[PDB]
């Protein structure tokens, strides 16, 4: 964890393997950002995003809080 851009999320989605596998904010009707590994993007109306980057976790949901659930 460095600067305050931590990699956050919006979408989850993971798949029984070995060990199991974790693609979060799968897609987007707009575009990433340099938080992931490699996003692909269709530069086309209706603008189209991405990320083929996979975790084993599934990043957060955007807006952290410690009031809601974090210990």
Same mark, same amino acid.
């Given at each position: 964890?460095?600067? =305050?851009?931590?990699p956050?999320?919006?979408?989850?989605?993971?798949?029984?393997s070995?060990?199991?596998?974790?693609?979060? =904010?799968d897609?987007?009707?707009?575009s990433?950002?340099?938080?992931c590994? =490699?996003?692909?993007?269709?530069?086309?109306?209706?603008?189209q995003?991405?990320?083929?980057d996979?975790?084993?976790?599934?990043?957060?949901?955007?807006?952290? =809080?410690?009031?809601?659930?974090?210990?």
């Amino acid at each position: 964890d460095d600067e =305050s851009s931590k990699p956050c999320c919006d979408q989850c989605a993971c798949t029984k393997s070995n060990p199991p596998q974790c693609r979060c =904010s799968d897609m987007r009707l707009n575009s990433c950002h340099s938080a992931c590994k =490699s996003c692909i993007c269709a530069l086309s109306y209706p603008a189209q995003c991405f990320c083929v980057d996979i975790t084993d976790f599934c990043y957060e949901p955007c807006k952290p =809080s410690e009031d809601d659930k974090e210990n």
